[PDB]
Every structure is written in structure tokens, then in C-alpha cells.
Paper text:
The voltage-gated calcium channel CaV1.2 is essential for cardiac and vessel smooth muscle contractility and brain function. The structure of the CaV1.2 channel complex is composed of a pore-forming α1 subunit and auxiliary subunits α2δ1 and β2b. Its α1 subunit consists of four repeat transmembrane domains (DI−DIV). Each domain contains six transmembrane helices (S1−S6) and forms the channel in a domain-swapped fashion.
To explore the molecular basis how tetrandrine blocks the activity of CaV1.2, tetrandrine (10 μM) was added during protein expression and purification. We determined the tetrandrine-bound CaV1.2 complex (CaV1.2TET) at 3.4-Å resolution. In our cryo-EM map, we found a well-resolved triangle-shaped density in the central cavity of the pore domain, which is well fitted with the tetrandrine molecule and positioned proximal to the selectivity filter. The two major moieties of the 6,7-dimethoxy-2-methyl-1-benzyl-isoquinoline ring are positioned close to the DII−DIII fenestration site and DIV, and they are stabilized by forming hydrophobic or Van Der Waals interactions with surrounding residues from the selectivity filter and S6 helices. In particular, the residues F1175S6III, M1178S6III, A1512S6IV, I1516S6IV, and F1519S6IV play important roles in stabilizing tetrandrine. The 6,7-dimethoxy and 2/2’-N groups from the isoquinoline ring form hydrogen bonds with the N741S6II and Y1508S6IV/N1179S6III residues. In addition, in agreement with observations in drug-bound CaV3.3 complex structures, a lipid molecule penetrates through the fenestration site between DI and DII and participates in hydrophobic interactions with the tetrandrine molecule. To validate the binding site of tetrandrine, we designed two mutants, N741W and N1179W, with the potential to create steric clash between tetrandrine and the binding site. The curves for both mutants exhibited a rightward shift compared to that of wild-type CaV1.2, indicating that these mutants reduce the sensitivity of these mutants to tetrandrine. The derived IC50 values for tetrandrine with the N741W and N1179W mutants are 71.3 nM and 41.8 nM, respectively, which are higher than that of wild-type (~14.2 nM), further confirming the binding site of tetrandrine.
Residue numbers in the entry:
A (entry chain E): 706 to 778, 889 to 943, 964 to 1078
B (entry chain E): 354 to 447, 509 to 647
C (entry chain H): 222 to 276, 297 to 314, 316 to 407
D (entry chain E): 1400 to 1484, 1494 to 1574, 1582 to 1593, 1607 to 1638, 1647 to 1655
E (entry chain E): 1137 to 1254
Write the structure that this text describes.
């Protein structure tokens, strides 16, 4: 934590930084390098060998002694879905450029010579992406046709971000504090690309599946961490003040 | 030495701010930022890999040592006793003791299982509701709430002691744990009643009461195997 | 041969019937049979030997009275003489014999030690009987009592009792 | 192998990039107008003013370098920027706690993903023959044969560089008799079976395993 | 961590100032907490992910086929391609080519570079 503060105190103890002194760094480097190597072996060996056995039971006993206990036994015409190929890469460009647009806005300057310039770039992107909102009407969905639109929530996110931008302009005339937070929520633009990139969908999906499996561990830690907090409160229930 | 401090990631930023103030803020970050990513994260990833990869050798080797097979033997073994010890209790009942059938029937009933879970939920609120300067009434509520919950938890504990065979009850590891905490709670009442408590006593005697929160997570088997395997090793 | 209008039901337990440990294993089991086969099932209790049957004086009338109940149109026979399918193989009455099993003998010592220390030293006299019961293939090993709990073990008896009734 | 693996998992590394960008922007705005001042974490060298500076602060908190001290700097009630013409937020407690948990988790996923996708090399007894043995076999063969000039051309035992690891008992001569050579060693270096029918059995394996030229496989 | 540890050790009583090293026994609480959550439980989670990913990785276990060493080896059946050597034809070129390709030259240069950093 303060590995440095201890070292410099040790060095200054043996005079200043020189050849005879200052070799005490060897003790701290040895302690940290050798010390941290033991902790990895002791705790990874415990957390891998014992953990591996535990899951082996979860997959050996549970799997088979339940196999045995069960072995006991509108307009729809002339629509143009064409051009969805070029727009695939083209749309990813606007998302990439739209994200950079909000990565350049200067927050400190309330009356900025740049925000007004950026404000226009939000108009063009807002208008551009609203076109695909109209395009989606031609495709199956619009909360209709067996809810083809509601069966893909990833596509719903595309509308919400656009709606958020659209709402901001309406409240902008009012010039009210409400728009302060609505602007922040517009940061969701980059996640728009998830629904459009096939390779990225697998990665983000794989993350969720992992969390579902991990649920058996994090839940234990939360109770354990909360258990320590309950002890912590009793030990130091307001004894930490200091004038 | 200065480079080595950065790789350990302690004092990494302080030196960066002492360089930005000497040669400007433009380039220097590339030196340190790349140093941490290349120096720390990759090696931290490499060291984790070999340690994780190496232990697969021993784990594979340990398979021939029958550590899992012996562990599997105890798990199935101790599990059977509880099942078989049920027969004797179900047969020992064929002074009238017909009520003993009724008390047992509730133990395995869902209503009883969730009732104690709710009691454990209340116990969390009694303790989790601590506060630096509690209202004078809240301490009394916690005082009475702690006592009332103590009687019910021991009251149902004794029910299982008589409903299920005394020897049978101690068979299960979890049932053994419940006796430990509930027994600890009795000391608190005596120690608080007799005013012989010490600062060391309250801590652990509080801690056992929190451990009753482990009444939750009983059906779940992912943690059950961890503890079972953990105790063997 | 000829069915005696019935398939008498007997139980050998996991070991010798002479001790209490085996006795409790079945009294609870028998109860559930008569609470789910009202009338269908009947129970008989005897204390003599049945092995010496020619298809001792008391044994002469033992078979007939069992047959007498079997004539009434299952029947559960309880006896302390059967300790191996061989004891009942000497007669062809189409009996149905049910086996209590402890897959791991290590369980027996824990169970026996629990009831009382007086019979704890008799585990040798008892554990041996379990071994004698671990040599009969399926043919003399019909009914399977392997699961530990009762509710999911008793139901494995009823399904086997639906072969004819 | 590790450098190669990182290339095979680029999208995972992109996810952590998206985490930095998303959190950098949110912090850029809610904590944008905090008052810079020395003696505090949010100072000339740390602030959510410019995107490069914000991302560095997020990187700084990622490595756990006095991040908790920053969290107290962005709490509400802090003086505001002089540019502004009472200016912090209470979202910080969730902002930094959430970032560290999410950042710590994604790094774990990134680390383990590379480990597992490269788990073959990490867990290798190094006793059975491996790809390394084939490569060094190529180099000696290459030094023994220039570009695409060898079909059999074998009349000497100069290819004796093979050590104990795949003329002891004349097995080499029998093996030699039994790219053409490259397949010969592998089918016999592991010694899959010795029954006088390995070629016939293996002739039916490459048929199902496979594709490419099969007029050299039988030898 | 240490700033809190030494503010917790110097804890006298509820609503009261600190006293130097009043109770150093309190350090057990932090040390126990550090080992359990920071070190131990954190490693279990890391170990769990490694094992959990392994199940996903071995989804195509295919126990019927032999070890994975063959998989690489058979896929290497398309190996044994020409490798650029370009043995010099001119006698003058060969003289320099041998020495530069000599193991002595490779080792000799490694000495120079080591000296260069020095
Ligand atoms: C996600 C990927 C983001 C990559 C960011 C790359 C930025 C490159 C250009 C940065 C540059 O040239 O400026 C350095 C900038 C400090 O700019 P400075 O001149 O101090 O600001 C004056 C304010 N009036 O900012 C810096 O000091 C650089 C901080 C870079 C942090 C990168 C961390 C990656 C993880
Ligand atoms: C934002 O992501 C990170 C930010 C900072 C860090 C890591 C990050 O990512 C991870 C990468 C890999 C893992 C966990 C996290 C898994 C890895 C690991 C790493 C790890 C652990 O300590 C808690 C525990 C574990 C568990 C076992 N295995 C092996 O890191 C260490 C130290 O261990 C060497 C350490 O010495 C004891 C000191 C510090 C740190 C981290 C580094 N910081 C927070 C501070 C000091
Ligand atoms: C079991 C859920 C948590 C409940 C306890 C925590 C919240 C209430 C206590 C803290 C209130 C502080 C007010 C000042
Ligand atoms: Ca620190
Ligand atoms: Ca740190």
C-alpha cells in the first residue's frame, strides 16, 4: 500500500542515498518480490486445487446420482430492405464518429466557442439516425406483427438513444435544469454499435453468461463482506472521531 | 528503483507528476502508461497463467492419488447416514408419543423452512440497523428484538433435537454449526444479564449472531461442495 | 409349479433379524404398505421356520396357515428364519423377497453404535450377515432397496407391486 | 503464444476500451466543472476536463492509486471552476465504486480469456513430442535440404539430430523404412499402436479427419 | 488501508478522541479481513472463472478421439514447405556468408550489444 513510504524511511535511516547505505532497498525488493510470490502460490493453490475438487463433486455426484434417481424409470408492399449491406459498415462509422463528437465537447467552458460547433454535429447525427428509425417501420416490428420489434431489445436501445436526443431539443427551449441530466444519459451512443457488430455481440453475450455462473460466488462474498461490516460497526461505532 | 516502483503500481502516479512538471505534460505519459500496461499487466497475466497452468499438472497428477475418490466416499457416506437414520426415527414411533410425528412433519415442511428463513431475515435487520447515535427507543427495540429472536431460534433448534435423533442431528455439518451459534447466543444472555461481559466477549458473541445469516444459502450446492472440499483439505 | 393364489411378501433386512437395528428398518416400511394398499395387502407374523418345506412339528402347520391366508385372495409374511435366498429356494411357492442393502458396510458400524453400546460389539455377528447377502445375482436378488430415504424408497416398492395388482 | 493469443481475442480488449470511454464521458460531464487546486486530488495534474486527462484519471483509478482519495474530491459541496459563470456531485460514490468493480471484472475476463485460449501450451508436460520438435526437425532438414528439392533423396543417416526425445536397437532403421517423412515420424514417434496394421487403420483415419493431396499420406 | 488501520487502533471510546496505540489487537480484524476477502475470496473467483471457462472450452471434448497432440500434428501434415536459404553461388559471397552465419558471429555480436547497453 505505502511500500514506498516504508522504503524511503529505511533508506534515510542508513544515511542518505549512497553506496554504503541505500542497499537496504535489497531487503524491501526481496520482501516484496519473494513475499508476493508466496501469496500467489498459497492462495491460488488453495483456490484452485480445493475449488477444482468442489466443482468435481458438483458435476460428478449431482450429475450421476440424479441420472440414476431419474433412471429409477399499415402497408406491406414495395418495401425496400435493400442497401442493408453498405449501411452495415456505414452505420458503424457514424456511431464511431458520433462517440468522438461527445468525446471532444469541452465541459469547463459553459460559453464555449466549440460546443456550438459540436451542437451542429449532434443535429446531423440526430437527423441521420432518425432516418433508420423510419426505416425500421418498413421492416417487421413497430410493436406489431407478432412483436418482431419487441423480440429484439437490442434494436429497442437504438430508439431510446434517439428519443433521448430528440427530447433534449424540446426541453432546450424551456432552458431548465431538467436537461442537465438528460444530456448525461446520451453517453449510451457507443453501446449502439453492439447490436450491429456480429463479433462484438458474442463477446458481450459471453460476459453475461459468465456472470450468471459466477452468481454462486459473488453472492457469498456480499454476505461475507456484509458480515464483516456488521462486525466493523460494533467495534468502531463512532470511536474514530479526532479533533 | 524508480522504474521498479511503477511496475508495483505504488507511487506510479507521483513520479509521473514530478516529470510532467519538468518536461511538460505532452509526451511523458506514454513512457509510464506503456510501462504499466507492458510492465505490470502482461506479467501479472503471465504469472497468473503459469501458476494456473502449472497447478493443472498437479491436479491431473492428484487424480491418480484418489483425493477426489476418497472425498467422494465421505460425501456419499455421511449423506446416507442422515437418510438411513430417518428410517429408525420413522420406525421408532411405529406415555403416548404420537405428537412426535406431528412435530417432525413440520420440520421438512416448506412452511417451517421459510419461517426460519424469515426469522434469519429479521435477525439481519436487528443487527444491520446499527447506527452511531440510535434513538433511545431503537436500542430497546434491538434489545427486545434480539431476545425474542434468540428464544425462537433455540426453540426450533430443540424441536429438531427431539424430533430428529440426537445422534442423527449432529451428523450433518450444517446442523452442527447451528448448535454452535445458538449455544453462543445463550452465553450473551447470561453474560449481559450478569454484567460480566468484556470488550472481547461482545465482538465474537456478536459475530456468532451474524453467522446465523449463513442459515440462508442452504439449498445451494455450489457453496456446499466448496466447504465440504475445503474441510477435507 | 402352481401359484398359491398369492405372492407372499417377506423381508430379510440388511442383516440378522435377531437384533433391533434391523427390526426398526422395516416396521416403518411395513406401515406405508398397508396405508396405500388398503385390502389389497395383508400382513402375517410368524416365529417358526419355513425353509424345511416339502412341496419341526410346529412347522408342519406353518405352511398351511400361510396358504390359508393366501386362499383368501398381497400377503406379507414376517419371519426370523430367512437370512439368504437359499433358505427360501428350498420351496417353490412363488414368494417375493425384498432386500434391504447398505452399499457401504462402513455405514453399519455408525448405525449400530448409535442405538446402544450393548450390541455394538455384536457388529461382527451382524456385519457378516450383510456380506452373506452380497453374493446373489439378480435372479435371487429381485427387489432393489438402494436409496436411503423412505419416501423415495417406499415408492420403489409400490411400482414393483403393480406387476399383477 | 501469448502475443499471438491477444490477437485472437481483440473484441474482448475492445470491451474494456468501451468501459473507459463510457465512464470517461460520464465523469467528464458530472465532474467536469470541479474547481482545480493543489493540495487536492482534483488538481492541475488530475481532472475530468479534457478527454485525455479524464481517461488517464480513470486509468489511475484502475490501478488503485489513491482512487478513494479522488472519490472524496468529487463529492458535492466543492468549489466550482472559475470558468463557470455547489458544483460537484454525489454520484461519485457509485461512479468510482462501480468503475473499479466493472474494470476489475473485465480485466479478469481479459486475463483469463487469454489464459484459456492459450491453455494448451501452459499445461504441457514437455515430455511427449510437440510442435517445437517438428520445427527444429524442419530447420535441420532445411539445412539438409534447400527450397523444395527433397522428395526422398535419403541415403545417409545424417538426420541423427533426434535425441532420446522422439541406432538404438535398429528401431530408427525400421522406422525409416516404414512432408512424406514428417508424417512418418509422428505416426510412429508417439507409437500409437504396434500391431502390423497401423497404416491400414490410419489410412481410414486421415480419410475422416480431413481435403488436400492424399497421394503422399500413405507413406 | 494503513491510514484507516492507525486511525482504528487509536480508538478510545464512542465519541472520543484518539489515543496512541490504545489497542493494537484491533489489527487482527483488518488482517483477517484482508486475507479472507482481498486475497482468498478474490482468488476463488479467479479460480472459478478459469474452471468455468474450461467447461466452455471443453464443450467439444470429444472423448472418442485421442489426445489433442494429434490434432495439432495432423493439422501440421501440410507443413514441410521450402525455406529460404539462398546458399551463395559466388565464392566471394560464400566467404562472408559462412562467417556471418557462424555460431561464433552470433555469439560475438551478443557480446557487443551487451557492452552497448553498458
Ligand atoms: C481509449 C483510448 C484513449 C487514447 C487517448 C490518446 C490521447 C492522445 C493525445 C493526447 C495528447 O497529446 O495530449 C496529452 C493530454 C494532456 O494534454 P495537456 O496538453 O496537458 O492539456 C492542456 C489543457 N489545456 O493527455 C495526457 O496526458 C494523455 C493521457 C493518456 C491516457 C491513456 C490511457 C489509456 C488506458
Ligand atoms: C483494475 O484491474 C486491476 C487493478 C489492479 C490490480 C489488478 C487488476 O486486475 C486484476 C488482475 C488479476 C487478478 C485480479 C485483478 C487476479 C490475480 C490477483 C491480482 C491482484 C490481487 O490483489 C488484489 C489479487 C489477485 C488474486 C490472484 N490473481 C493472481 O493484484 C494485486 C496484487 O496481487 C499481485 C497485489 O499484490 C498482492 C497488489 C495489488 C494488486 C491489484 C492490482 N491492485 C489492486 C492493487 C495492489
Ligand atoms: C438489511 C438491509 C439494510 C438495512 C440497514 C441499513 C439502512 C438503515 C440504517 C442506516 C440509516 C442511516 C440514516 C442516518
Ligand atoms: Ca497506495
Ligand atoms: Ca494499489
Amino acid at each position: 500500500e505505502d511500500w514506498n513510504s516504508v522504503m524511503y524511511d529505511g533508506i534515510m535511516a542508513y544515511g542518505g542515498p549512497s553506496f554504503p547505505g541505500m542497499l537496504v532497498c535489497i531487503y524491501f525488493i526481496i520482501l516484496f518480490i519473494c513475499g508476493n510470490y508466496i501469496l500467489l502460490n498459497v492462495f491460488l493453490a488453495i483456490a484452485v486445487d480445493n475449488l477444482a475438487d468442489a466443482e468435481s463433486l458438483t458435476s460428478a455426484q449431482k450429475e450421476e446420482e440424479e441420472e440414476k434417481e431419474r433412471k429409477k424409470l399499415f402497408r406491406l408492399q414495395c418495401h425496400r430492405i435493400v442497401n442493408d449491406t453498405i449501411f452495415t459498415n456505414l452505420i458503424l462509422f457514424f456511431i464511431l464518429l458520433s462517440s468522438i463528437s461527445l468525446a471532444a465537447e469541452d465541459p469547463v467552458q459553459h460559453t464555449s466557442f466549440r460546443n456550438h460547433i459540436l451542437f451542429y454535429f449532434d443535429i446531423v447525427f440526430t437527423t441521420i439516425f432518425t432516418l433508420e428509425i423510419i426505416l425500421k417501420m418498413t421492416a417487421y416490428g413497430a410493436f406489431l406483427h407478432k412483436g418482431s420489434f419487441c423480440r429484439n431489445y437490442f434494436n429497442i436501445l437504438d430508439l431510446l438513444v434517439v428519443s433521448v436526443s430528440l427530447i433534449s431539443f424540446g426541453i432546450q427551449s424551456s432552458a431548465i435544469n431538467v436537461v442537465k441530466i438528460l444530456r448525461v444519459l446520451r453517453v449510451l451512443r457507443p453501446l449502439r454499435a453492439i447490436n450491429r457488430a456480429k463479433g462484438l455481440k458474442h463477446v458481450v453475450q459471453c460476459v453475461f453468461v459468465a456472470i450468471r455462473t459466477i452468481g454462486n460466488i459473488v453472492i457469498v462474498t456480499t454476505l461475507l463482506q456484509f458480515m464483516f461490516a456488521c462486525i466493523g460497526v460494533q467495534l468502531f461505532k463512532g470511536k474514530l472521531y479526532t479533533c | 528503483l524508480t522504474v521498479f516502483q511503477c511496475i508495483t503500481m505504488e507511487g506510479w502516479t507521483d513520479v509521473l507528476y514530478w516529470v510532467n512538471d519538468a518536461v511538460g505534460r505532452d509526451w511523458p505519459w506514454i513512457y509510464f502508461v506503456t510501462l504499466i500496461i507492458i510492465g505490470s499487466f502482461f506479467v501479472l497475466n503471465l504469472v497468473l497463467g503459469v501458476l494456473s497452468g502449472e497447478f493443472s499438472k498437479e491436479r491431473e497428477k492428484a487424480k491418480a492419488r484418489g483425493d477426489f475418490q476418497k472425498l467422494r466416499e465421505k460425501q456419499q457416506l455421511e449423506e446416507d447416514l442422515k437418510g438411513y437414520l430417518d428410517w429408525i426415527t420413522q420406525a421408532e414411533d411405529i406415555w403416548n408419543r404420537f405428537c412426535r410425528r406431528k412435530c417432525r412433519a413440520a420440520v421438512k415442511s416448506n412452511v417451517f423452512y421459510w419461517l426460519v428463513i424469515f426469522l434469519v431475515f429479521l435477525n439481519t435487520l436487528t443487527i444491520a440497523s446499527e447506527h452511531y447515535n440510535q434513538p433511545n427507543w431503537l436500542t430497546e427495540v434491538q434489545d427486545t428484538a434480539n431476545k425474542a429472536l434468540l428464544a425462537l431460534f433455540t426453540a426450533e433448534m430443540l424441536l429438531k433435537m427431539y424430533s430428529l435423533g440426537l445422534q442423527a442431528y449432529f451428523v450433518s455439518l450444517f446442523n452442527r454449526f447451528d448448535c454452535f451459534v445458538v449455544c453462543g447466543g445463550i452465553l450473551e444472555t447470561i453474560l449481559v444479564e450478569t454484567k460480566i461481559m468484556s470488550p472481547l466477549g461482545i465482538s465474537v458473541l456478536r459475530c456468532v449472531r451474524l453467522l446465523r445469516i449463513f442459515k440462508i444459502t442452504r439449498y445451494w450446492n455450489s457453496l456446499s461442495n466448496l466447504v465440504a472440499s475445503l474441510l477435507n483439505s | 409349479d402352481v401359484v398359491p393364489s398369492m405372492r407372499p411378501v417377506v423381508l430379510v433386512g440388511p442383516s440378522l433379524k435377531g437384533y433391533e437395528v434391523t427390526d426398526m428398518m422395516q416396521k416403518a416400511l411395513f406401515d406405508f404398505l398397508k396405508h396405500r394398499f388398503e385390502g389389497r395387502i395383508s400382513i402375517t407374523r410368524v416365529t417358526a421356520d419355513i425353509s424345511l418345506a416339502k412341496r419341526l412339528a410346529e412347522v408342519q402347520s406353518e405352511i398351511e396357515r400361510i396358504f390359508e391366508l393366501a386362499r383368501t385372495l398381497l400377503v406379507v409374511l414376517d419371519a426370523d428364519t430367512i437370512n439368504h435366498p437359499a433358505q427360501l429356494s428350498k420351496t417353490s411357492l412363488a414368494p417375493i423377497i425384498v432386500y434391504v442393502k447398505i452399499s457401504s458396510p462402513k455405514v453399519l458400524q455408525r448405525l449400530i453404535k448409535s442405538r446402544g453400546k450393548s450390541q455394538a460389539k455384536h457388529l461382527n455377528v451382524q456385519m457378516v450377515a450383510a456380506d452373506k447377502l452380497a453374493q446373489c445375482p439378480p435372479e435371487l436378488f429381485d427387489v432393489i432397496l438402494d436409496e436411503n430415504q423412505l419416501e423415495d424408497a417406499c415408492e420403489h416398492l409400490a411400482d414393483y407391486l403393480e406387476a399383477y395388482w | 503464444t501469448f502475443i499471438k493469443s491477444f490477437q485472437a481475442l481483440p473484441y474482448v480488449a475492445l470491451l474494456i476500451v468501451m468501459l473507459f470511454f463510457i465512464y470517461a464521458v460520464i465523469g467528464m460531464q458530472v465532474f467536469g466543472k470541479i474547481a482545480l487546486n493543489d493540495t487536492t486530488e482534483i488538481n492541475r495534474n488530475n481532472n475530468f476536463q479534457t478527454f485525455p486527462q479524464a481517461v488517464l484519471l480513470l486509468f489511475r483509478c484502475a490501478t488503485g492509486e489513491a482512487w478513494q482519495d479522488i472519490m472524496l474530491a468529487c463529492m458535492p459541496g466543492k468549489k466550482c471552476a472559475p470558468e463557470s459563470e455547489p458544483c460537484g456531485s454525489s454520484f461519485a460514490v457509485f461512479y468510482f465504486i462501480s468503475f473499479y468493480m466493472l474494470c476489475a471484472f473485465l480485466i479478469i475476463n481479459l486475463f483469463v480469456a487469454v489464459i484459456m485460449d492459450n491453455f494448451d501450451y501452459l499445461t504441457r508436460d514437455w515430455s511427449i513430442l510437440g510442435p517445437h520438435h517438428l520445427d527444429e526437425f524442419k530447420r535441420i532438414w532445411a539445412e539438409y535440404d534447400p527450397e523444395a528439392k527433397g522428395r526422398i533423396k535419403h541415403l545417409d543417416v545424417v538426420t541423427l539430430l533426434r535425441r532420446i526425445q522422439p541406432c538404438p536397437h535398429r528401431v530408427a532403421c525400421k522406422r525409416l523404412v516404414s512432408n512424406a517423412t514428417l508424417f512418418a515420424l509422428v505416426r510412429t514417434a508417439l507409437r500409437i499402436k504396434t500391431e502390423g496394421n497401423l497404416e491400414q487403420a490410419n489410412e481410414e483415419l486421415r480419410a475422416i479427419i480431413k481435403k488436400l493431396l492424399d497421394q503422399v499420406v500413405p507413406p | 488501508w494503513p491510514e484507516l488501520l492507525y486511525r482504528s487502533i487509536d480508538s478510545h471510546t464512542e465519541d472520543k478522541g484518539p489515543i496512541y496505540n490504545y489497542r493494537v489487537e484491533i489489527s487482527i480484524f483488518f488482517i483477517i479481513y484482508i486475507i479472507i476477502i482481498a486475497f482468498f475470496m478474490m482468488n476463488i473467483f479467479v479460480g472459478f472463472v478459469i474452471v468455468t471457462f474450461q467447461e466452455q472450452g471443453e464443450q467439444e471434448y470429444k472423448n472418442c478421439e485421442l489426445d489433442k497432440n494429434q490434432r495439432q500434428c495432423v493439422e501440421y501434415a501440410l507443413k514441410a514447405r521450402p525455406l529460404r536459404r539462398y546458399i551463395p553461388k559466388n565464392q566471394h559471397q560464400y566467404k562472408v556468408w559462412y562467417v556471418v552465419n557462424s555460431t561464433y558471429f552470433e555469439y560475438l555480436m551478443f557480446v557487443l550489444i551487451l557492452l552497448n547497453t553498458i
